[PDB]
Amino acid sequence: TKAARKSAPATGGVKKPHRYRPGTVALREIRRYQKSTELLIRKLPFQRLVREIAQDFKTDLRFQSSAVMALQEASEAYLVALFEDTNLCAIHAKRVTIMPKDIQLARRIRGERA
Amino acid sequence: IGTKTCRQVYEFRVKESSIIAPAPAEDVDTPPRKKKRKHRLWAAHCRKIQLKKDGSSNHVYNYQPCDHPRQPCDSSCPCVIAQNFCEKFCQCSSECQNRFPGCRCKAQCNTKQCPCYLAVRECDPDLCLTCGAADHWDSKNVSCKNCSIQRGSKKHLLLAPSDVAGWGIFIKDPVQKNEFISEYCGEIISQDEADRRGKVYDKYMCSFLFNLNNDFVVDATRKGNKIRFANHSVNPNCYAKVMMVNGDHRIGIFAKRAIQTGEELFFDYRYSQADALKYVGIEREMEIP
Amino acid sequence: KVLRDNIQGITKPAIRRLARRGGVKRISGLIYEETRGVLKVFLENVIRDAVTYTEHAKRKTVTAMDVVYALKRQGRTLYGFGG
Numbered sequence A: 001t002k003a004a005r006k007s008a009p010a011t012g013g014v015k016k017p018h019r020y021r022p023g024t025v026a027l028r029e030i031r032r033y034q035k036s037t038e039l040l041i042r043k044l045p046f047q048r049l050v051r052e053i054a055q056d057f058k059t060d061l062r063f064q065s066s067a068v069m070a071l072q073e074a075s076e077a078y079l080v081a082l083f084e085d086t087n088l089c090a091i092h093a094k095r096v097t098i099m100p101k102d103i104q105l106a107r108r109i110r111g112e113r114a
Numbered sequence B: 001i002g003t004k005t006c007r008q009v010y011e012f013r014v015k016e017s018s019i020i021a022p023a024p025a026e027d028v029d030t031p032p033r034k035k036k037r038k039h040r041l042w043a044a045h046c047r048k049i050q051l052k053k054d055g056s057s058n059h060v061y062n063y064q065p066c067d068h069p070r071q072p073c074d075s076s077c078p079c080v081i082a083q084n085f086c087e088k089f090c091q092c093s094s095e096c097q098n099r100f101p102g103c104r105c106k107a108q109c110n111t112k113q114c115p116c117y118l119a120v121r122e123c124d125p126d127l128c129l130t131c132g133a134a135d136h137w138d139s140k141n142v143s144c145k146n147c148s149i150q151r152g153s154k155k156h157l158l159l160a161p162s163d164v165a166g167w168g169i170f171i172k173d174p175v176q177k178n179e180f181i182s183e184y185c186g187e188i189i190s191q192d193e194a195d196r197r198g199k200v201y202d203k204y205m206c207s208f209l210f211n212l213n214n215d216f217v218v219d220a221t222r223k224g225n226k227i228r229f230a231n232h233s234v235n236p237n238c239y240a241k242v243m244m245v246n247g248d249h250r251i252g253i254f255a256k257r258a259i260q261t262g263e264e265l266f267f268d269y270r271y272s273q274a275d276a277l278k279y280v281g282i283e284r285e286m287e288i289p
Numbered sequence C: 001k002v003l004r005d006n007i008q009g010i011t012k013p014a015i016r017r018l019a020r021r022g023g024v025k026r027i028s029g030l031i032y033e034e035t036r037g038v039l040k041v042f043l044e045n046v047i048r049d050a051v052t053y054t055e056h057a058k059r060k061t062v063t064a065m066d067v068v069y070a071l072k073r074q075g076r077t078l079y080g081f082g083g
């Protein structure tokens, strides 16, 4: 047995975690990275990587420290340049995402693929 | 101690410190210093709490100060098992994840975007610093709207014989939608005795018991304020809404629509349909169509 | 747990960063592989020449100017490191 209690609707509404929509993070990255001028690849792995590959061509190559960072910068710009044009190939097919068949096509038109 | 100068105070302190054990005099700083406490992590915790138990949305428990002298704020936490946040009165430390984060709604802690408004909790004075909840506690007008019950900015009412039945309540001044009105004061009594008093109530068709939460019912039969005489209607200009204030469950009334001078106030008692016919069957309505 | 080919030492996010600097919005998963191979190819040429100047000079140590000279050969001059 329960008396006729007056009552009001109770609720449990709570805050919603916030998630940015896909892509808008990247756009923020583009501007900050284009403005940014520092190198992007972790510094240490390259010095091991260059030593490993160089060992094939010859043995016992002590590497001058100054000569090291050059390879990154040269490779970086080469990679960066090789990247941007890939978008133009990608957007040309009306897509937005790049796939390796494009990076192959792009390296052909430059002539380097052959 | 004006009875002694600083000498013979320090000296007797030497005498006392020689006799009694020296004081601990310990200080701590805790590992956490700043950041690493993004409030979205708190959103995960209540998401957990909502999914396990608070999905029921019927077991409203009165706040109880959980004590954790050396325990963490684990699943054994009384507030945790009570499906409710740890209040600042709890012994859960200043790092408890069940405590409220702080209610930083800039314009007014008063709308759907206000989590505190979304919460059943009124934005605490020490928390909604952006709506001035703490600011000018002496003053009556603040930017916030969900801080009134603390300040008790009640409106002025009038007592008159209601058209529906006997005495009724009339408002002195015009108000708009969702505007704060006077609280429904009363006395704290347990559910089981509310049955007994309610059992006594039905013998003379009285109703002054309000189901405050799952654990308590408030009564205004003997002690209360004027609003207890409000009538019933199925299409009211006012509605009841439970709220959480400083660990105290309270019920307020707000205008369901904008209201002009001299209106008669109504709200739904929300009993059963058969019960509604038993007590509040009068509807005072002509059918236009 | 680092003993392997150092090519995999080029972490996937590092690539993701570079695509951003080139303005790439969306990247498919299969890109991460040929990019390794394509980059791998690039080193093969430059060091080969870079080795060549060093050993011709009888030097056992690869120096900075040797790098730019080879880079100049591939039609990519490098301002900033000598000459």
Ligand SMILES: Nc1ncnc2c1ncn2[C@@H]1O[C@H](CSCC[C@H](N)C(=O)O)[C@@H](O)[C@H]1O
Residues within 6 Å of the ligand: B162, B164, B165, B166, B167, B168, B205, B206, B207, B208, B228, B229, B230, B231, B232, B233, B279, B280, B281, B282, B283
């Ligand atoms: N709309 C309504 N029609 C008939 N009785 C009502 C009613 N609303 C409330 N009551 C009765 O009033 C009691 C609440 S106390 C209010 C009493 C009423 N306003 C008067 O002055 O006469 C309840 O016990 C209920 O039985």
